[PDB]
Design a protein around this ligand. Structure first.
Ligand SMILES: CCCCCCCCCCCCCCCCCC(=O)OC[C@H](CO[C@@H]1O[C@H](CO[C@H]2O[C@H](CO)[C@H](O)[C@H](O)[C@H]2O)[C@H](O)[C@H](O)[C@H]1O)OC(=O)CCCCCCCCCCCCCCCCC
Ligand code: CLA
Ligand code: CLA
Ligand code: CLA
Ligand code: CLA
Ligand code: CLA
Ligand SMILES: CCCCCCCCCCCCCCCCCC(=O)OC[C@H](CO[C@@H]1O[C@H](CO)[C@H](O)[C@H](O)[C@H]1O)OC(=O)CCCCCCCCCCCCCCCCC
Ligand SMILES: CCCCCCCCCCCCCCCCCC(=O)OC[C@H](CO[C@@H]1O[C@H](CO)[C@H](O)[C@H](O)[C@H]1O)OC(=O)CCCCCCCCCCCCCCCCC
Ligand SMILES: CCCCCCCCCCCCCCCC(=O)OC[C@H](COP(=O)(O)OC[C@@H](O)CO)OC(=O)CCCCCCCCCCCCCCC
Ligand SMILES: CC1=C(/C=C/C(C)=C/C=C/C(C)=C/C=C/C=C(C)/C=C/C=C(C)/C=C/C2=C(C)CCCC2(C)C)C(C)(C)CCC1
Ligand SMILES: CC1=C(/C=C/C(C)=C/C=C/C(C)=C/C=C/C=C(C)/C=C/C=C(C)/C=C/C2=C(C)CCCC2(C)C)C(C)(C)CCC1
Ligand SMILES: [Ca+2]
Ligand SMILES: [Ca+2]
Ligand SMILES: [Cl-]
Ligand SMILES: [Cl-]
Ligand SMILES: [Fe+2]
Ligand SMILES: [Mg+2]
Lengths: 38, 504, 56, 30, 65, 342, 39, 34, 167, 37, 81
């Protein structure tokens, strides 16, 4: 409820890490399964 | 002083000189129409409506005269190929002369209106300031447009008092000017039904009369008067430009796709008739009907009108030109003289082979022959070292049916190849390339040139509309924004409603 | 390959044409040619131009 | 004639550069 | 400003500059005609486009004969 | 006057995080659907039945190769409405027939109208001149000429650009091989306006940043500016002297400078649009006739112009059978144009 | 006769009128509930 | 002190809601084998 | 000759599919966009200093101390066009962005050419999508490939004696 | 005749002359090849 | 400011994260299952890897008729046995 409880630098670091993971998965998928040329 | 791009703004508060400038513009346009018709008459060859019609000759205004019933010359010829006709005054020449005289009269009127600009008529009786009551002017002009539209439809197009309009069969073989009765059913909205054009003008005409009376008699609502700035002549410019670009896109579309008002005998065939082999299908139908009735192959093909075969040739497709390839279609492939006849290709085994036709997209196209099921049987190879389908290997021959080569067969590979190269263009014709020093490169017809100019001008007029609409609605700030503009009028949350000071 | 106006080009087709593939990356100043006629055949102007231009 | 035309237009543009630079209206602080 | 015979005759036709009907006046009626016109254009467009296909309405050069 | 219209007007024009306006009623649904349709198609939808291509993440494409592809050529210029005679209300079949293409193009077009109306509406409320809306006419002329007029002049929507990265690249190369579009002076003016605009953007940004007045003590100079300050933040006089001495000429009038920055890229885009209107009709700048007459008679005459046409002929022959599947092209190996070895 | 595509046309027309009708109903409603404060 | 359901709230969710749904879909796709 | 260079470059490097050229395009399209944007916004907020019968340009005098437009009104406009925080209220920041966007993009364009110079080429997804049997399912990448092949086989038609074009 | 009060003088400054001549000359240099064809 | 709660307030609050540690994963999983169940293929009509061609077929199922296009696709789908 109260604004400030979870520091913005943590929210950014976690969200940013979330983006890296998902994009990373998409790059993994370029080399495996459909679209891999194999 | 005024920048160069603003010189004509001196007319905004001068109704008399605006009328003068409009008169001058009208004089120039009518003078263009007259001059253009004269130049076309000085260059037009009326001797062959079949293989040298107006649309092969770069005629632009001639088809518009023809569309509405002007078909003959004082010199005795008609565009349908008649001789010894008397067109009366309203020949192509009479039309041209009428436009030149009109030009002159409008020029003189312009001089009068320029000199005598300060007429009491143009002054608001209450303020003594120049003023035009545009809402009432609109009703008056709309009423007049309505009457003219109605009369054009009810008298000219019907033939009731007038010549009618150009009409033809589905294959543009027997076109002429005919009276046309209005079509009042749903087929009136079919672009290819001439009766719909007649019904349009009668009906929209009546509607224009009624709406005109309304606009004469009923004042604009205060709310619309203020919103559209109806005291400012520039609002009319903005909306008129919008109407004009709409109309221009429409005439571009109906020129390109074809309609009852863009007949193929006046403007040439469409690109879509090539795409769908429209003429080839009809030609084949007619040949099959001839064969079914007992005709020989030579007789069946000899019964095909040269005019029909000519439509089945890519040189007449308007999507085969170039932007800087100037002039008449005749300047390209040449002046068409005669159909060579239908070429039938056969291999050594005697199977009929079919040349793959060039689609409009392609400036150049290979020569590939298939059997009736699309299997490749012969071609002209690029690399020869592994060729398997050469005309030499497959013993390809060509025999002609109908036209000038009727009954002839060629077996020598150079000649057979030559005809195969032409067969990619569809039906094969003899051309005079000498008379005009034709260069062999395809040009578009008046159908293509019209469509281009009108789509382009339409798009540019969209900018004109945006610009003048902007000037109208933002007249107050067009020399700049308020120097005393308060930062609070643009700072967020200060007013509840953007720009409204009563909502602090 | 013709690049110049007087040899059949317009503004759109015209060019100063790159030096010969036989030269490769070899430095080909005027004085390395036996004559101006040779220099021109082998695309010497291209090297003179692009080297002075890049420096400039 | 084409070559003359192209070179003529180019030469006019070069002359224009000269005038636009050395014979410009001078910028003045008011 | 100059008076003329024809100017005097036409004077009433250019004497009501600025004259308005109160408020919204005929705006709602206008709106209905605009709506009907939009539908009309949509109909003619969709016919030309072969998205609306009607009996006895053959959108083709072969419309009749 | 205080009816529902004015009350609605009040609410529409409230100063909120995302301004709405009357224009918002057109803009927001059309833009949302255009974007949503693109994301939906590129994620889930095939082009197997219209093009013989995979085009979605679902099928294994990546961000570069996904597209919402144009309908089959046989559809012509069908509006391809969901409830139209082709799809007949079937959402699945509609997707397979390329319905999402006209969906995106048409909502896109109405959305762009909405955006420009938004530019006008906001300018009017804030009390500024509407030059931003005027400038936006260039994006609109491009969208309309390329995505609407071009395919309308061609056989069908099939030949419009498909909405995709690689698909757009295909569209560029098609225009080279078929239209020789690089040779077109309207495209050339477009290029000059785009590159000239990018030049003006860079040079003006750099000039301002390098003629700044020292208005703070900080070595990072951004804080030394105040929105409400009366004074110019940089020296026009010093900037003018610099460019006069470097390049020979320089701006001296800031109003002219900024108008020119509107004029150049806007005019460029408008020029390119005109050329594309010609290409709708195959009205190309494909050839120089004098060049061809000479080269036909003289087998030693060669220019970069003749060289590029050979490239075009290769593009056409090599790409057409797969790029234009409705034509059922079969080009035997022996007819394919090729130079030595390759 | 009402062809299948004319029936389709009516459906499109109805669907459009509903979307626009419901959109304006909702916006008018919200505008009435959430009036701007003046004076 | 602050409203929750605003025009801004709606705008945000019209984008964010499908985005997360789509990202889950695309993540699943990475495990599809022919 | 420039167009010749471009077409052959596409054949040999698939430059269109290279991210540095894509950044270049973002650089110049964006440069033009921001050029038009900045032009239009400054022009939109010029302070009234002239009458309608004269160019508004006369409203600015070379070397004047006061700014000639209202940046607060400009930001007020553009911040509402998108949303407040997507608009610049700091002229130094705005002008830095104007410098940086095209310059960085064009640096990447230059580096695209300069690295394809050593044959590190655009993305190659030729036959990347394959069905359950092993049939190639073309994507737009494969259609690009067909265009590229046309360029490749035709360029310098008498210069190659051996099957691979290695430089 | 009594003079027209709507008359305005017209101006083209030198810079505008130079800009205009450049536009025209460069357009001519661009389009000339196509006019000759 | 325009009256809405600052984003930085919202996304640093406990309540936002109580709500969104549910709704975000829920949406993501729903998206996942939309694909993993195969429903996506069915909704959009996208071929599965085994459904581009019949076993011996190498011809693309190209739509060639505007008004019978629906039936053509249906016929193409039937031929996958
Ligand atoms: C400015 C910026 C403002 C912002 C823009 C806002 C965007 C609004 C969106 C509007 C969408 C318009 C779509 C028009 C679809 C169309 O046209 O669809 C085309 C149809 C015609 O259909 C086509 O017709 C062709 C020819 O057929 C004819 O010929 C054939 C062969 O002989 C047969 O005989 C056949 O039966 C016969 O009908 C082919 O069949 C094609 O496959 C078929 O699609 O016309 C029609 O619906 C209507 C044609 C007339 C009106 C056209 C006005 C608008 C378009 C202007 C652009 C012109 C393009 C010229 C290029 C330059
Ligand atoms: C029974 C009476 C009757 C009949 C039989 C007709 C018959 C006809 N009318 Mg008329 N009409 C009538 C009464 C009638 N009308 C009345 C009472 C009015 C009110 C005054 C009108 C007003 C009217 C208008 C405004 C038009 C017609 C048109 C037509 C023709 C339609 C076929 C066609 O070619 O469309 C072709 C035109 C269209 C299919 C309309 C296109 C609409 C576009 C798509 C709207 C968007 C425009 C925008 C600028 C496009 C930008 C994007 C683009 C560049 C991609 C046909 C001759 C049309 C015409 O003149 O055709 C030649 C037309 O535009 N009529
Ligand atoms: C709607 C306009 C229009 C159309 C469609 C036509 C159509 C036609 N005419 Mg007519 N004509 C017209 C108006 C038109 N004319 C006018 C106004 C005149 C008086 C000049 C003429 C005088 C005329 C003559 C004397 C002849 C024709 C002929 C022809 C045919 C060949 C056309 C051709 O080769 O064009 C070529 C078109 C081009 C090369 C395109 C020009 C594009 C310009 C140069 C672009 C300019 C760009 C601009 C400067 C950029 C500014 C940028 C800036 C804003 C930054 C064709 C049927 C020929 C015919 O065969 O007669 C029987 C013929 O001999 N016409
Ligand atoms: C009916 C159509 C129409 C009319 C009556 C006007 C009238 C006006 N315009 Mg608008 N405008 C239009 C359409 C029209 N415009 C279109 C289609 C566009 C986009 C191309 C514009 C874009 C536009 C801009 C950007 C401006 C105007 C301005 C003006 C005003 C001053 C014009 C002037 O002094 O120029 C003087 C022109 C010259 C001295 C030479 C022009 C030479 C042209 C570019 C090339 C040659 C043209 C050729 C002779 C014409 C052939 C006819 C053509 C239809 C084929 C005046 C009220 C100005 C304004 O608002 O002032 C406050 C202004 O800044 N117009
Ligand atoms: C302002 C927002 C807006 C606009 C301008 C459009 C515009 C368009 N839509 Mg989109 N759409 C929208 C919002 C919008 N939509 C929303 C919110 C949704 C989610 C429901 C959709 C979902 C959607 C789908 C699924 C499709 C479209 C399609 C279309 C196109 C054809 C629409 C049509 O023919 O309507 C015709 C109807 C009108 C123009 C309304 C007329 C209203 C008049 C004035 C009143 C008369 C009606 C009367 C009361 C009815 C009596 C009839 C009686 C005789 C039986 C066009 C581009 C189609 C398309 O893109 O195909 C490629 C399509 O398939 N839309
Ligand atoms: C980018 C497009 C665009 C923009 C930004 C403007 C902007 C402007 N217009 Mg112009 N206008 C346009 C295109 C545009 N117009 C088109 C294509 C036409 C038809 C010819 C017009 C006709 C026009 C007139 C007659 C007038 C204006 C005026 C104005 C001004 C006031 C705002 C207004 O009236 O909007 C008008 C509203 C719109 C453009 C939005 C229309 C949205 C439609 C109804 C949605 C239709 C959905 C459709 C039915 C779905 C089916 C699709 C089908 C393909 C299946 C402003 C300068 C007025 C002005 O100048 O006052 C001084 C004025 O009098 N406009
Ligand atoms: C919370 C935030 C909500 C805000 C979102 C607003 C909506 C607009 C978002 C538009 C983004 C469009 C990009 C989608 C990419 C994607 O999903 O790829 C998803 C693909 C999926 O990966 C593919 O999956 C297939 C599954 O069968 C195969 O495995 C393929 O081999 C594999 O490549 O991932 C990639 O291609 C990796 C690169 C993605 C990076 C995108 C490039 C960035 C350039 C974008 C520039 C546009 C500006 C956007 C700014 C934001
Ligand atoms: C006042 C002074 C006015 C002076 C006019 C200035 C002349 C400048 C030259 C104009 C350039 C046009 C030259 C074309 C080349 C040529 O020689 O054509 C020459 C052609 C004639 O074509 C000739 O025909 C002859 C037989 O009649 C022979 O066949 C010749 O071989 C053939 O060249 O002239 C025209 O066709 C003019 C009409 C063109 C109309 C096309 C409409 C499209 C225009 C829309 C474009 C709008 C663009 C706006 C963009 C912003
Ligand atoms: C620090 C990162 C450096 C990145 C590369 C350089 C970018 C900036 C240079 C552009 C030159 C423009 C012409 C001069 C324009 C000019 O004169 O600039 C002036 C401007 C302000 O000057 P100041 O003097 O205030 O500050 C610089 C120093 O004096 C230290 O205070 O300089 C900067 O803002 C530098 C910012 C560095 C941090 C910016 C990083 C942004 C790039 C991020 C990279 C992402 C790309 C990914 C691709 C997908
Ligand atoms: C006075 C008089 C007279 C007479 C008259 C006359 C003689 C006339 C005329 C006239 C004329 C004779 C005219 C004309 C005209 C023209 C024109 C007006 C034109 C134009 C043009 C243009 C505008 C163009 C353009 C262009 C170009 C150039 C190129 C390409 C593009 C374009 C198309 C854009 C008379 C005895 C009756 C009587 C009374 C008096
Ligand atoms: C079509 C349609 C519709 C609709 C729909 C929609 C509206 C949708 C939506 C949707 C959506 C709305 C979606 C989405 C999404 C998304 C996504 C998928 C995303 C993503 C992303 C990403 C992946 C990112 C990344 C990145 C970037 C770009 C930047 C920087 C970095 C990175 C790399 C991080 C309807 C029903 C009416 C009807 C019919 C049709
Ligand atoms: Ca000769
Ligand atoms: Ca498997
Ligand atoms: Cl080469
Ligand atoms: Cl080699
Ligand atoms: Fe600036
Ligand atoms: Mg994968």
């Amino acid at each position: 409820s109260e604004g400030g409880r979870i520091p913005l630098w943590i929210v950014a670091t976690v969200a940013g890490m979330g983006v890296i993971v998902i994009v990373g998965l998409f790059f993994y998928g370029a080399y495996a399964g459909l679209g891999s040329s194999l | 002083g005024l920048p160069w791009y603003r010189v004509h703004t001196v007319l905004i508060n001068d109704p008399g000189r605006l009328i003068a400038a409009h008169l001058m513009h009208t004089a120039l346009v009518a003078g263009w129409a007259g001059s253009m018709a004269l130049y076309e008459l000085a260059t037009f060859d009326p001797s062959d409506p079949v293989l040298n019609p107006m649309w092969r000759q770069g005629m632009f205004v001639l088809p518009f005269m023809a569309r509405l019933g002007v078909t003959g010359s004082w010199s005795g010829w008609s565009i349908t190929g008649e001789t010894g006709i008397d067109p009366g005054f309203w020949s192509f020449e009479g039309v041209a002369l009428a436009h030149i005289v009109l030009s002159g009269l409008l020029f003189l009127a312009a001089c009068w209106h320029w000199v005598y600009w300060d007429l009491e008529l143009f002054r608001d009786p209450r303020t003594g300031e120049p003023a035009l009551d545009l809402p009432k002017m609109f009703g008056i002009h709309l009423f007049l447009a309505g009457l003219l539209c109605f009369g054009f439809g009810a008298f000219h197009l019907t033939g009731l008092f007038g010549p009618g309009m150009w009409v033809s069969d589905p294959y543009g073989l027997t076109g002429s000017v005919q009276p046309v009765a209005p079509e009042w059913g749903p087929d009136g909205f079919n672009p290819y039904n001439p009766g719909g054009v007649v019904a349009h003008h009668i009906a929209a005409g009546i509607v224009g009369i009624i709406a005109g009376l309304f606009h004469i008699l009923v004042r604009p609502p205060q709310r619309l008067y203020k919103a559209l700035r109806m005291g400012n002549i520039e609002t009319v410019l903005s909306s008129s430009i919008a109407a004009v670009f709409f109309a221009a896109f429409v005439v571009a579309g109906t020129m390109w796709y074809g309609s009852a008002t863009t007949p193929i005998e006046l403007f040439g065939p469409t690109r879509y008739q090539w795409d769908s082999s429209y003429f080839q299908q009809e030609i084949n139908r007619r040949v099959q009907a001839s064969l079914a009735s007992g005709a020989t192959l030579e007789e069946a093909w000899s019964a095909i009108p040269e005019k029909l075969a000519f439509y089945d040739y890519i040189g007449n497709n308007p999507a085969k030109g170039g932007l800087f390839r100037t002039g008449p279609m005749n300047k390209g492939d040449g002046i068409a003289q005669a159909w060579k006849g239908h070429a039938v290709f056969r291999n050594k085994e005697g199977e009929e082979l079919f040349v793959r036709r060039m689609p409009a997209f392609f400036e150049s196209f290979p020569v590939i022959l298939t059997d009736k099921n699309g299997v490749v049987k012969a071609d002209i190879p690029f690399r020869r070292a592994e060729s398997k389908y050469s005309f030499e290997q497959q013993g390809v021959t060509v025999s002609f049916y109908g036209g000038e080569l009727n009954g002839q067969t060629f077996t020598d590979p150079p000649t057979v190849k030559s005809y195969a190269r032409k067969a990619i263009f569809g039906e094969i014709f003899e051309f005079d390339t000498e008379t005009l020093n034709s260069d062999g490169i395809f040009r578009t017809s008046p159908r293509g040139w019209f469509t281009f100019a009108h789509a382009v001008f339409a798009l540019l007029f969209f900018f004109g509309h945006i610009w003048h609409g902007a000037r109208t609605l933002f007249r107050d700030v067009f020399s700049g924004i308020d120097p005393e503009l308060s930062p609070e009028q643009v700072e967020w949350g200060f007013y509840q409603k953007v720009g409204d000071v009563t909502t602090r | 390959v013709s690049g110049s106006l007087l040899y059949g080009n317009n503004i759109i087709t015209g060019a100063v044409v790159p030096s010969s593939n036989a030269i490769g990356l070899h430095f080909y100043p005027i004085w390395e040619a036996a004559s101006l006629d040779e220099w021109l055949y082998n695309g010497g102007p291209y090297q003179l131009i692009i080297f002075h231009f890049l420096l400039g | 004639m084409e070559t003359i035309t192209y070179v003529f237009i180019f030469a006019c543009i070069i002359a224009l550069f000269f005038f636009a630079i050395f014979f410009r209206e001078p910028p003045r602080i008011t | 400003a100059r008076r003329t015979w024809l100017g005097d005759i036409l004077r009433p036709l250019n004497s009501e500059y600025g004259k308005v009907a109160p408020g919204w006046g005929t705006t709602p009626l206008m709106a209905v005609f605009m709506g009907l016109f939009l539908v009309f254009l949509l109909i003619i467009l969709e016919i030309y486009n072969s998205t609306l296909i009607l009996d006895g309405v053959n959108v083709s050069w072969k419309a009749l004969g | 006057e205080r009816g529902w219209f004015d009350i609605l007007d009040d609410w529409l024009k409230r100063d909120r995080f995302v301004f709405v306006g009357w224009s918002g009623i057109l803009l927001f649904p059309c833009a949302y659907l255009a974007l949503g349709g693109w994301l939906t198609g590129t994620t889930f939808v095939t082009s197997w039945y219209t093009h013989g291509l995979a085009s979605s993440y679902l099928e294994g494409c990546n961000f570069l190769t996904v597209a919402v592809s144009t309908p089959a050529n046989s559809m012509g210029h069908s509006l391809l409405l969901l409830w139209g005679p082709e799809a007949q209300g079937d959402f699945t079949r509609w997707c397979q027939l390329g319905g999402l293409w006209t969906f995106i193009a048409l909502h896109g077009a109405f959305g762009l109208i909405g955006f420009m109306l938004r530019q006008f509406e906001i300018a009017r409320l804030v009390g500024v001149r509407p030059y931003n809306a005027i400038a936006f006419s260039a994006p609109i002329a491009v969208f309309v000429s390329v995505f609407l007029i071009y395919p309308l002049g061609q056989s069908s929507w099939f030949f419009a650009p498909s909405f995709g990265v690689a698909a757009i690249f295909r569209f560029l190369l098609f225009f080279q091989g078929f239209h020789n579009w690089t040779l077109n002076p309207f495209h050339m003016m477009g290029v000059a306006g785009v590159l000239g605009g990018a030049l003006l953007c860079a040079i003006h940004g750099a000039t301002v940043e390098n003629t700044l007045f020292q208005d703070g003590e900080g070595a990072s100079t951004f804080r030394a500016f105040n929105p409400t300050q009366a004074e110019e933040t940089y020296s026009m006089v010093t900037a003018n002297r610099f460019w006069s001495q470097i390049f020979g000429i320089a701006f001296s009038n800031k109003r002219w400078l900024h108008f020119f920055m509107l004029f150049v890229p806007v005019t460029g885009l408008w020029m390119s649009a005109i050329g594309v209107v010609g290409l709708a009709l195959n009205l190309r700048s494909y050839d120089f006739i004098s060049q061809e007459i000479r080269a036909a008679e003289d087998p030693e005459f060669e220019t970069f112009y003749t060289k590029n046409l050979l490239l075009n002929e290769g593009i056409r022959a090599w790409m057409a059978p797969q790029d234009q599947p409705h034509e059922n092209f079969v080009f035997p190996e022996e007819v394919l144009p090729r130079g030595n070895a390759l | 006769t009402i062809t299948p595509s004319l029936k389709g046309f009516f459906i499109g027309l109805l669907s459009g009128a509903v979307v626009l009708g419901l959109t304006f109903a909702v916006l008018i409603a919200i505008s009435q509930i959430d009036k701007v404060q003046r004076s | 002190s602050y409203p929750i359901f605003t025009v801004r709230w709606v705008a945000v969710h019209t984008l964010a809601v499908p985005t997360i749904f789509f990202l889950g879909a695309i993540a699943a796709m990475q495990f599809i084998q022919r | 000759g420039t167009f010749n260079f471009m077409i052959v470059f596409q054949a040999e490097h698939n430059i269109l599919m290279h991210p540095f050229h894509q950044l270049g395009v973002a650089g110049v399209f964006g440069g033009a966009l921001f050029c038009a944007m900045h032009g239009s916004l400054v022009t939109s907020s010029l302070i009234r200093e002239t009458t309608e019968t004269e160019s508004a340009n006369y409203g600015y005098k070379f070397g004047q101390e006061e700014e000639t437009y209202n940046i607060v009104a400009a930001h007020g406009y553009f911040g509402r066009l998108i949303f407040q925080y997507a608009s610049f209220n700091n002229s130094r920041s705005l002008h830095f962005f104007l410098a940086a966007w095209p310059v960085v993009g064009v640096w990447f364009a230059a580096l695209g050419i300069s690295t394809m110079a050593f044959n590190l080429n655009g993305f190659n997804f030729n036959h990347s999508v394959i069905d359950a049997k092993g049939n190639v399912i073309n994507t737009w990448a494969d259609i690009i490939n067909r265009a590229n092949l046309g360029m490749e086989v035709m360029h310098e038609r008498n210069a190659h004696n051996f099957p691979l074009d290695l430089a | 005749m009594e003079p027209n009060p709507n008359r305005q003088p017209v101006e083209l400054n030198r810079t505008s002359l130079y800009l205009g001549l450049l536009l025209i000359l460069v357009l001519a240099l661009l389009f000339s090849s196509y006019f000759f064809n | 400011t325009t009256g809405e709660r600052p984003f930085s307030d919202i996304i640093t609050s406990v309540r936002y994260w109580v709500i969104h540690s549910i709704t975000i994963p829920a949406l993501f999983i729903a998206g996942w299952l939309f694909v993993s169940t195969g429903l996506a293929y069915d909704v959009f009509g996208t071929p599965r890897p085994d459904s581009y061609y019949a076993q011996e077929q190498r011809s693309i199922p190209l739509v060639t008729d505007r008004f019978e296009a629906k039936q053509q696709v249906e016929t193409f789908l039937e031929q996958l046995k």
